[PDB]
Amino acid sequence: GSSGSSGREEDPHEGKIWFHGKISKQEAYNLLMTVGQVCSFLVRPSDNTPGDYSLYFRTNENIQRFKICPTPNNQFMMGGRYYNSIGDIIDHYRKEQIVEGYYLKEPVPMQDQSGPSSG
Incomplete structure (x- = not known):
């Protein structure tokens, strides 16, 4: 007895509002400038490197990019x-500035294409 379904499922990590996967590296840039704003960051899965991550923060000056490499200690x-x-x-950075003089206010919202709004 299958006692369950299979095929179409969603992951918890892909449910985060600060997480971004549907978009791309280039988009993320123009995104943090449009959908986002000063004091806004977002996490995205390293493309060129399947297994790592990269943080994208936006500052009045310019957009930065951090590197998050995986550790053998989970x-x-x-x-x-x-x-x-x-x-x-x-949650930690929210207390300790991540930059020389910047703090994490709120991440960038995810876009949900699915919708009636059509051409």
């Missing part, structure tokens, strides 16, 4: 740091 590394998990890294 954790993530950011700027020579070590946190339990991504979600945490953020």
